[PDB]
Amino acid sequence: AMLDFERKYRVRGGTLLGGDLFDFWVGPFYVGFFGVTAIFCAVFGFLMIGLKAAISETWSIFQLVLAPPNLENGFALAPLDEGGLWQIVTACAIGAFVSWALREVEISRKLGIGYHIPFAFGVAISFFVLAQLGRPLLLGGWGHAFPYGIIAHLDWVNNVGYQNLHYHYHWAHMLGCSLFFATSFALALHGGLILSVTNPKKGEVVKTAEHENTFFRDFVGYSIGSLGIHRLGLALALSTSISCIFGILTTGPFWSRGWPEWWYTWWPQIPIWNW
Amino acid sequence: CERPPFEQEQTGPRGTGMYVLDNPRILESRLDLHTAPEARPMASEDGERAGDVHENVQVLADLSDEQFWRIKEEMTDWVAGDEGCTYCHTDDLASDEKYQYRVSRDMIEMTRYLNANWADTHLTHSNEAGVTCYTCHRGEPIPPASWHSEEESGETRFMTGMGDLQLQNKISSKTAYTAFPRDALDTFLVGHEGELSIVGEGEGGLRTATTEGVSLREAYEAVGLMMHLSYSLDAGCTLCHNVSRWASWEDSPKERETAWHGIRMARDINVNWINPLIDEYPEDADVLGPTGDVGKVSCQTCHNKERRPLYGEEFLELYPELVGEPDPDFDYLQFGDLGTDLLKGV
Amino acid sequence: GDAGIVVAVLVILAILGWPNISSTLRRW
Amino acid sequence: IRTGLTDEECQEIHEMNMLGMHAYWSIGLIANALAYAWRPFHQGRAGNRLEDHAPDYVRSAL
Amino acid sequence: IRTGLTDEECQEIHEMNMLGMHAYWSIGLIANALAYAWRPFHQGRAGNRLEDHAPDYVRSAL
Amino acid sequence: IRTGLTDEECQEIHEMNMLGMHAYWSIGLIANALAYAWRPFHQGRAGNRLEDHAPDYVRSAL
Amino acid sequence: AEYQNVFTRVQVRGPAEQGLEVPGGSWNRVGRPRFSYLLGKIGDAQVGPIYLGATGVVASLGFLIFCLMVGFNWLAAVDWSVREVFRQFWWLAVEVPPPEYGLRIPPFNDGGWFLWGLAICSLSLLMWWARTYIRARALGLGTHVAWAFAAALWFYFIITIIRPVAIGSWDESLPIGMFAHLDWLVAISERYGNFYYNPFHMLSIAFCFGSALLFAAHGATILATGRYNSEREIEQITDRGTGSERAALFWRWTMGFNATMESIHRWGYWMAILVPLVASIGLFLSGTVIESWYEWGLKHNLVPIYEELSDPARNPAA
Amino acid sequence: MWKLWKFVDFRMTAVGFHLFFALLAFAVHFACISSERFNWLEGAPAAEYYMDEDPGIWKRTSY
Amino acid sequence: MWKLWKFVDFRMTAVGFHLFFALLAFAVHFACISSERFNWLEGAPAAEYYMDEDPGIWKRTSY
Amino acid sequence: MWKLWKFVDFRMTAVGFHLFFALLAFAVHFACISSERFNWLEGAPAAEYYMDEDPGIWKRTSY
Amino acid sequence: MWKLWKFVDFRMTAVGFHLFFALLAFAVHFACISSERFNWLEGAPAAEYYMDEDPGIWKRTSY
């Protein structure tokens, strides 16, 4: 139940908050106080999701949604049957994500590694927070935040995108879709490169960093290298999450017309070609 | 760049994203464009008929003299612009030398028809508004949001050459500045063969052996028309839809239904009233479009980037002389849906 | 007609270009 | 750059290549002759569009 | 940069290259001559559009 | 910097380069002469738009 | 704070490495290796040399021919005004054939240029894939990069050729335009129900979001464990060090399970290349098997049902 | 051309021709399918069924 | 130019010419299909079928 | 220019010139295709077919 | 300026100038095609065809 080398690192300390009381492992998982709070928020939020499934009679992961209150509700606490369950689960999700990231900070301290992983997770959490708080603050109510349904939040994404007519044309959407595609492209390239170096044809020896460098130099003229590929990957995925922040915070709050009309508003009128 | 706050209208269930944000500052900036002029005082119906005290009066013959003068002054304030009476009139006030005179005669007929027949289904959705001359013209001879056929549907096509966008892939307010087909206004607000119900249905959501849908190009054209609808009403797709289920009328806000009639009404306006005006126009008139066509009526023509024309100002009671008698055989399904009986000439 | 000439030429080319016949012109 | 093949290996590969290319070439030529006799690939000056020769009731994809 | 090929290797490469280039060239010239005799590639001053020469009932994709 | 080629290698590269460029130049000049005699590339003052010369039932896609 | 392994503050330059010996490398490796200090901040500074292979050169030439066909069509669309091309750069496109041709290759200006460019672009992409394969093989590498490109190209061929052919119409294919191919996205999703209700769309987005997740997490993991030379991952795979151990233990203590230095790349490789693969499956089923993803997910209890609206819109056409 | 395998890898040449010919066989079969005259699957008539004489290919026919 | 292979890799040149000629054969065949006169797949008539005189190519014909 | 190959790589010069001339041949054929006068695939008439006189190029003709 | 190659790489300069001049020839030929007067592909008339006098360039002509 423990890795061949795991016990060698399973030491006390590294906790941000929890001391030695929560500083232990249950099976593979390190717990920590932030693990305790993450489990609390996760299980309570899932129990509120089940409560909405019960009250809405929607026992389908796909059809069940915790939607935020109505727009007329504003920032007020809603009835649990009118968006209050969504508010509870929003608090639970923020708490669980923050607790998970802080538990990862604890694990990083215990392993002596940098806090890059909880930082990247915190970038994703920052998207969630700015989407579920920043968009309500910009637009004046919890009802502008996306709901909690496996399929229904896709419907919210659909409707919020089509509120600006053609959401593809959103500048933040264009940049962020390019960034997601570049992230999957670079993950494919990087996994393929590492596996190609370490899994050549049968009978061939494992190649080196020189091999992979000259592979991408021969291939596309540039090789970003071992450190560069991971730096670029963290950058690409993070930047796509920041692009998601900008997209969710600008569609509506900072452009209520169509994003096609947004593009028409400035690009065709750029004076170097508007004549 | 835009800015909060916004006038919000939740058009669907909470959390679905079905709401419309309208910029209050933008509506304030378009307030001059979106408000009809102060109405003239009501004119008495008692008096000599306008067809008796004037030589060449036919469309307004059944009007009293005072009602006639009221509506003439209002039409001057609504279509004449800065040209005034001379816009439609020569030195002789009973002579139709100017095409504007006869076109305005047909326009009075069309406004009467619209207020008599399209009020129950489209023109009085929120308010007993109806339409006046100002609803489209907005004080100008040419309605600012009148549309012509694109200067690619009428051009000679170089079939084996280069650079044919197929009425797409170009900047146009007619598609809300999308790359969607620009001739969608011709396809749907003039033509009747166009299919707007582009979303697949199948059976069980499946392309059954009996399932026949529209082509992807027909989907392009319909989505372009829908972009025009959204542009015209200054709202998103959520104004009339849960975009997740476009084909579902039960999941769509009521504004879809009236929008439907608007589509047909535009077709009506274009087929029975606007296009037959081409005979009245001079052959080389500068007002005519690049394809030599009269400017047609679209959603934007009355919805000049506004949810309801002229802030839903009521004109049916305010201008009874612009309200005609209901057409005995009027049927909103006879504009290319159940048939083409009411689309004259097609 | 002309289709006959085309078919005959294609058949003749297949016969001449068949490996058993085309290889007779192999020179190394 | 050189492939390292000997003269004998190159000649063996070339015999196999001549067999493959020319067998495929003859089979394809016979196939195209058969398809050409079925329906000549190239229209005459009159063309071979159904709309220009068939009656109106004969549907054509145009 | 130098490919390292000897004069004799370059000459056998060039023998094959001349063979392939000129055989493809002659076959293509014959193919283009056949397609030109079928339908001349370049129109006269009158052109060769069907609309300008065919009756009205002959549909033209142009 | 320097490519490292000797004078003789540069001279034979230039022989082949002169041959290639000038053979292509002459073939292109002949081809452009043929295409120019077919249809002069440059219009006169009257132009060569069909709409300005054709009897106006001739379709001009211009 | 500690060094975050985000930028290389001190770059070192050796002799410009032409590359490991490959057949034809001495001739086909072109370009004096140039060192970008800006690129050296993140990764390797060296730019070039590039392999000037037959597949690479002809694929790049075909890409250029395709781009120039698109540009010439855009010019002829805007009366050969480069000014109007740049003004309408995002809107302009080489449009696909209309449905009345079906699978017929139409005249150039009725979608024939699109099919011409599709042939050129597809052949160029296949030559580029061949270059990927051959560049990997010449270095004694696995062809994993070639097969990731093959997954992406399989999706591309589904978008452009295979699925338009199966549907039987070229108008289903992707227009060559910035805004036009996004309009293709909208048209495909709305014509065929809703791709939000397409489970292969769901899975492809799961794998794209998870490519971002894994590649953020993996880049962060490698930058965090770069204190222990974990960025030299080939060594950590053949000679597992404390950096790979710490990465595995971080993820095991977080998630309960971890990967290895090689298996994390297996995970990321498959998570990435699954995006175009299940994407191709879902797109192909859209219009061949599935007519409406909304109706199909309604039958499968996948589509949520929301509160019935007060005063719904009634279809006036019954 | 037997000297070609002194300089061009035969294995890659044959693999590339087989791959390209699979691709091209698909492309050419599709080109036949796209033509109603040649789409055997749809099975449309040939215009020669309705012609009074042989159209030819080079026959220099006149209307 | 038999000396070109002293300075130009013949393997690249031959394989690249084959690749580019596959690409160009597709380009040119597609160009012919995109032409009504030259689309053998659609089989449109030639204008020479309806012309009473040879149009020529360089023949200085006049209307 | 025989000394240019002492300083300029004939490899890249020749390869890039062939690649660019392929691209330019396509570009020029596209320019001809886009021209009604010069599209041989369209086969439009030359205006000279309808002019009663030689337009010239530098002929300095007058209406 | 023969000493410029002591400080400025001639290969870089020549390659960059040829690349820029390819792009510039494309751009300038495009400028001509954009111009109605200079578009030989469309072949529009010159206004000098309808002028009864030389317009000049620097000539102080008055309407």
Ligand code: A1LZM
């Ligand atoms: C009509 C309409 C429409 C739309 C809509 C819209 C809107 C409104 C928006 C959007 C978006 C976008 N998108 Mg889209 N769309 C379209 C489409 C598309 C396409 C195609 C192909 O077509 C593409 C590719 C695209 C993509 C995209 C991207 C980019 C983005 C997304 C991503 C995100 O965000 O997430 C982000 C997210 C995130 C970060 C998340 C995080 C978690 C957390 C912490 C974690 C944790 C959790 C949990 C639960 C735990 C678990 C446990 C275990 C399991 C045990 N698109 C259409 C058009 N759009 C956004 C933005 O903007 O960005 C920029 C927004 O806002």
Ligand code: A1LZM
């Ligand atoms: C309808 C239907 C159809 C078809 C069909 C099919 C399928 C399905 C397939 C095929 C094929 C194939 N083809 Mg064919 N075709 C067709 C036509 C044709 C042509 C024309 C011209 O037209 C050609 C030339 C061909 C050819 C061929 C090859 C290339 C391949 C095989 C290879 C071989 O070896 O043979 C073999 C080879 C052979 C045949 C070749 C040869 C030369 C000769 C002597 C000379 C020439 C000429 C020219 C070009 C001029 C003329 C024209 C004019 C106008 C008078 N194809 C049609 C249209 N397909 C295959 C493939 O691709 O694989 C890959 C397949 O699968």
Ligand code: A1LZM
């Ligand atoms: C309709 C249809 C058609 C066709 C068809 C086809 C197909 C399908 C194919 C082809 C080809 C090919 N072609 Mg041909 N054509 C056509 C025309 C032409 C022309 C003109 C002029 O137009 C040219 C120049 C050509 C040429 C050629 C080559 C380059 C290639 C290769 C082959 C050879 O080698 O031959 C060989 C070569 C040859 C034939 C050539 C040579 C010089 C000569 C003596 C002289 C020159 C002149 C000039 C340019 C100017 C005149 C014009 C004017 C306007 C008067 N193509 C038509 C349009 N295709 C191929 C390819 O691409 O490969 C890849 C293919 O597949």
Ligand code: A1LZM
């Ligand atoms: C075996 C061996 C061999 C060879 C070799 C060799 C050597 C040594 C050399 C050469 C060459 C060569 N080529 Mg070759 N080849 C072969 C083949 C071939 C073929 C086939 C397919 O068969 C072909 C087609 C070929 C082509 C060529 C060309 C590219 C070149 C020439 C160029 C000229 O001349 O110019 C000349 C020309 C001139 C000066 C004139 C200029 C203009 C420019 C830009 C233009 C610009 C313009 C623009 C951009 C605008 C346009 C307009 C429109 C509106 C858009 N190859 C074989 C393989 N080769 C040269 C060069 O590169 O230079 C540098 C040299 O030296």
Ligand code: A1LZM
């Ligand atoms: C329509 C139709 C057309 C055409 C057609 C075609 C095709 C298809 C092709 C071609 C070509 C080519 N061209 Mg040509 N063209 C055309 C014209 C022209 C021109 C004018 C001026 O216009 C030029 C300058 C050219 C030129 C050339 C070259 C560069 C190349 C060849 C190479 C050589 O070397 O030759 C050879 C060369 C040559 C021919 C040339 C050179 C200088 C000379 C002496 C002198 C100059 C002068 C000037 C500029 C002045 C103007 C005046 C007026 C009055 C304003 N192109 C038309 C428009 N294409 C090719 C290419 O690109 O390849 C890449 C191809 O493919």
Ligand SMILES: C/C=C1/c2cc3[nH]c4c(c3C)C(=O)[C@H](C(=O)OC)c4c3nc(cc4[nH]c(cc(n2)[C@@H]1C)c(C(C)=O)c4C)[C@@H](C)[C@@H]3CCC(=O)OC/C=C(/C)CCC[C@H](C)CC/C=C(\C)CCCC(C)C
């Ligand atoms: C730019 C960087 C990114 C990035 C980076 C990164 N993400 C990381 C790490 C790093 C570095 C981790 O280190 C961490 C980990 O341990 O696994 C590898 C983690 C993780 N992310 C996960 C999901 C993920 N992430 C996504 C996006 C990115 N992730 C972006 C692209 C996406 C989407 C949609 O794109 C998803 C679904 C989990 C698997 C895991 C957290 C577990 C947790 O929160 O515990 C807490 C434990 C649980 C069970 C949470 C339950 C909490 C509430 C009460 C349950 C209800 C859930 C909601 C209300 C959410 C909305 C529902 C939608 C339907 C509307």
Ligand code: HEC
């Ligand atoms: C175009 C929109 C008009 C403007 C502006 C004005 N008039 Fe007009 N007028 C117009 C029409 C089409 C008609 C015919 C009405 C009918 O029922 O057929 C008229 C009618 C008159 C008349 C009576 C004609 C007659 O028989 O003598 C008069 C006297 C008249 N109009 C005057 C008039 C004045 C003074 C205006 C400016 C304030 C004016 N008209 C504006 C069309 C249009």
Ligand code: HEC
């Ligand atoms: C919208 C449905 C309209 C109403 C209501 C009225 N008019 Fe109109 N009118 C409309 C359009 C789209 C056009 C064509 C504009 C174009 O682009 O060509 C017109 C045209 C006229 C004209 C002629 C304009 C001109 O060429 O100068 C006149 C004189 C006119 N309309 C008068 C008119 C009057 C008097 C109306 C009220 C009774 C009226 N119109 C209503 C659209 C609409």
Ligand SMILES: [Fe+3]
């Ligand atoms: Fe890695």
